[PDB]
């Protein structure tokens, strides 16, 4: 099957995650992706924190495969960099190594809504999310699951305030485009843009715009929440809505009249965002019901919102002190 000397040589030379890093009791993240540890090198060559991602299950899953394949190729300041892959031969577990990102939008937003976000920081965050997704889209890579928990932000150090898009391995549908909820069979660039729109709205208000209570694509309560914010789409607004596999279900369960006094203007005005601001006009272009009428990432980056004072900064915090607490060990 395999040569003895070949196996023995490789076994002697193979770097093991447990020999290189101390991570026992250093777990900071959990999910569908696997587990994330804040580790330190066992050899004192560095004192910087590292993120160790132990992939879910044994062997090479589809998720583990997609993440390794893509991150091995992708090189952008706003996309998380894969530094090394550890293949634990004993328990068949896959480990991914990256530089540690102290923050993410899930924790940043949570901190701000617990108080009840500086506008320069909101703009810089959105510019870096769009920059990262534009690079992915130009390389024909769709994220398929953008959300605040995936938009990492670097802490103190040589990359302070830099956004990093994480989770390339792809319960809650708050960031899911309306065409997916109506049965669209394929993921598209427009689906990622809708998610960015959701994130932008949440950064401006500290609230998930399409927050909804908890296996088919059709999710009634989620669509009801979209319509309560956006209004029910008129035929002119989304002509191909009739072509959607769940259009007949939509016609059976909903009536456009229920959402007559509903619009994004009305929603954003309740959360003190002005409908004549450049921020609102951009948000509305990102949150377009019809995917073919949704702005692209490159067009969004060219928006006059980014030319208005203040300009977006490379450090989203802009040399100001980070008020956000460090991630706690689970």
């Amino acid at each position: 099957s395999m040569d003895y000397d070949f196996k023995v040589k490789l076994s002697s030379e193979r770097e093991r995650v447990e020999d290189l890093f101390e991570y026992e009791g250093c777990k900071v993240g959990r999910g569908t992706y696997g587990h994330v540890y804040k580790a330190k090198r066992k050899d004192g060559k560095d004192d910087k924190d590292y993120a160790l991602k132990q992939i879910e299950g044994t062997g090479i899953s589809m998720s583990a495969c997609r993440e390794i394949a893509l991150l091995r190729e992708l090189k952008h300041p706003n996309v998380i960099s894969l530094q090394k892959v550890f293949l634990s031969h004993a328990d068949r577990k896959v480990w991914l190594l990256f530089d540690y990102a102290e923050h993410d939008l899930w924790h940043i937003i949570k901190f701000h809504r617990a108080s009840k976000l500086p506008r320069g920081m909101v703009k810089s965050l959105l510019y870096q999310i769009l920059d990262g997704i534009h690079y992915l889209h130009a390389n024909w890579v769709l994220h398929r699951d953008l959300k605040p928990a995936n938009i990492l932000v670097m802490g103190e150090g040589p990359e302070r305030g830099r956004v990093k898009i994480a989770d390339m391995g792809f319960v809650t549908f708050w960031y899911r485009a309306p065409e997916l909820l109506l049965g669209a069979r394929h993921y598209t660039k427009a689906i990622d843009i809708w998610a960015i729109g959701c994130i932008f709205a949440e950064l401006l208000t500290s609230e998930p715009i399409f927050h909804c209570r908890q296996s088919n694509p059709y999710h009634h309560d989620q669509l009801d929440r979209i319509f309560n914010v956006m209004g029910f789409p008129a035929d002119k607004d989304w002509e191909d809505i009739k072509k959607m596999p769940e259009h007949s279900t939509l016609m059976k369960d909903f009536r456009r009249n229920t959402y007559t006094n509903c619009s994004l203007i009305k929603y954003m005005e309740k959360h003190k965002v002005k409908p004549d601001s450049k921020a609102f006009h951009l948000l509305q272009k990102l949150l377009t019901m019809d995917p073919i009428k949704r702005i692209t990432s490159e067009q969004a980056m060219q928006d006059p919102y980014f030319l208005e004072d203040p300009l977006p900064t490379s450090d989203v915090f802009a040399g100001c002190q980070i008020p956000y607490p460090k991630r706690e060990f689970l």
Binding site: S1, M2, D3, Y4, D5, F6, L10, R14, G59, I60, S61, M62, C65, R66, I68, A69, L70, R72, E73, L74, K75, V85, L87, H89, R92, N139, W140, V141
Partner: protein, 264 residues
């Protein structure tokens, strides 16, 4: 994925020098002649093609599996891992990378057993000896020894773009596509960018079908001396094809091939 080839792992690490490739081959060339070694490479290319066909996988998946197989043996001896185990492992990994899915334990083992029994009985008198535990072990070694380089670029996408640009899709594409498949009987995928392999295949297709494409090729601004090097290899592979009788020669060639050493 459809990224820039010049920034890819394929270009930066897997476009090898012919001499460095010949130097690594010397380890196996003590048992097999240079002629027998390329014959063995064609055989396993045809084994991977037959495995993919049985599993009803797209040409993209088969091509990715073939490149994995070749990249592994470009750096390691035929005795490191049995090529009979590597071929279905490469298919298994390629199917996952190419978003086709995880081939089931039952479907993969039955495909390897059936294909070798039906289409390769002349070279294998005994049944496929490996189970799923062997594939899963081999997979871990394959991923590690390719430095986790999974995204592979093939000549099919640029060939389709070139033929469409010529406005000769109906006439040239079926033959040029077939020549690209035949290219996997060689080391070309390890030595040249895919767009260059596609252009040479399109050139050979133009010569065979007697179509004047001199002006189209002249307006490209590509290293034609490099396209000519590939053309020579393509023409050579058909002469090799003619003189090679796979069914009469392979049992002997496989017997000469170094085998994995067991533990003491």
């Amino acid at each position: 994925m459809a990224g820039n080839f010049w920034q890819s792992s394929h270009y930066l690490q897997w476009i090898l020098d012919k001499q460095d490739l010949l130097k690594e081959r010397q380890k196996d060339l003590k048992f097999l002649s240079e002629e027998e070694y390329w014959k063995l490479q064609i055989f396993f290319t045809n084994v991977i093609q037959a495995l993919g066909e049985h599993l009803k996988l797209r040409q993209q998946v088969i091509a990715t599996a073939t490149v994995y197989f070749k990249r592994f043996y470009a750096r390691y001896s035929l005795k490191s891992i049995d090529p009979v185990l590597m071929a279905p492992t490469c298919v298994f990994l390629a199917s996952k990378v190419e978003e086709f899915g995880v081939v089931s334990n039952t479907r993969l083992i039955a495909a390897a057993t059936s294909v070798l029994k039906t289409r390769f009985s002349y070279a294998f008198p005994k049944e496929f000896p490996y189970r799923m535990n062997h594939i899963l072990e081999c997979e871990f070694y394959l991923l590690e020894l390719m430095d986790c380089c999974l995204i592979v670029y093939h000549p099919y996408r640029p060939l389709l773009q070139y033929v469409q640009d010529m406005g000769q899709e109906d006439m040239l594409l079926p033959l040029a596509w077939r020549i690209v498949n035949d290219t996997y009987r060689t080391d070309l995928c390890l030595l040249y960018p895919p767009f260059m392999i596609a252009l040479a295949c399109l050139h050979v297709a133009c010569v065979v079908q007697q179509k004047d494409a001199r002006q189209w090729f002249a307006e490209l601004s590509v290293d034609m001396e490099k396209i000519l090097e590939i053309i020579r290899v393509i023409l050579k592979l058909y002469e090799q094809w003619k003189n090679f009788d796979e069914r009469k020669e392979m049992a002997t060639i496989l017997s000469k091939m170094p085998k994995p050493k067991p533990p003491p």
